[PDB]
Ligand binder design. Structure first.
Ligand SMILES: [Cl-]
Ligand SMILES: [Cl-]
Ligand SMILES: [Zn+2]
Ligand SMILES: [Zn+2]
Lengths: 21, 28, 27, 21, 27, 21, 28, 21, 27, 21, 28, 21
């Protein structure tokens, strides 16, 4: 999930965009 | 568990911003 | 703008109240 | 929704708890 | 609502300015 | 109090320092 | 000391929210 | 205090409620 | 006050969008 | 500037990206 | 890299506040 | 820079004041 992918390394804006509706 | 709690809070502010009108969901 | 600033606080508050369950936000 | 109910007056925690999963 | 959003910034600012001394917040 | 003084105009740090312990 | 500084900031936002009209105090 | 109890493990809302006025 | 609260969100948003490049903020 | 453009209506990310270095 | 990302976000809120009309710059 | 000086130990308000314009 978002925690596993984005709290152990930095997610870019493009990567964060995967969890929008 | 605490470091994850704090990181999650900044994730949600970032998502709110990135996703605009589309909005988002957050599942810990 | 008032709406957009208020929404930022709402999602912080849902983050806290919802816990493990999580949530959705739709403007 | 949540913007209409909660940005025109103060929602309590119990009120916000309504929009959780 | 304007009051309630502004209060959230105030407590962040007291957190910083007060340091080891700490503070109270009463609406 | 702090809401009346500081949400109707901008309090400086010295102004906010008034409400510390 | 830094991790405690950052955590404390999220504590206060949480307390502001939880305590409403009663308000709160924070003593590091 | 709040730091010792809530920065080494997660305090719930019920636990945070102990530091209100 | 409305300006001062909005500015706080702006700098959070610049922090995110600008990345390694960084930024300046001038009121 | 950024306060005039972005506190009277909602700036997108592309709009905010204008003020980076 | 993540701990630095989170700390930086609180730095900028602090600078915004400390510097007032003078404003500031942030270079990671 | 600011990250090296202020993310490994706590910078005071006086220290943060060095990065204003
Ligand atoms: Cl943090
Ligand atoms: Cl606000
Ligand atoms: Zn944080
Ligand atoms: Zn705000």
């Amino acid at each position: 999930g978002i925690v596993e992918q984005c709290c152990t390394s930095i997610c870019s804006l493009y990567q964060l965009e995967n969890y929008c509706n | 568990f605490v470091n994850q709690h704090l990181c999650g809070s900044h994730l949600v502010e970032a998502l709110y911003l990135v996703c605009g009108e589309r909005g988002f969901f957050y599942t810990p």
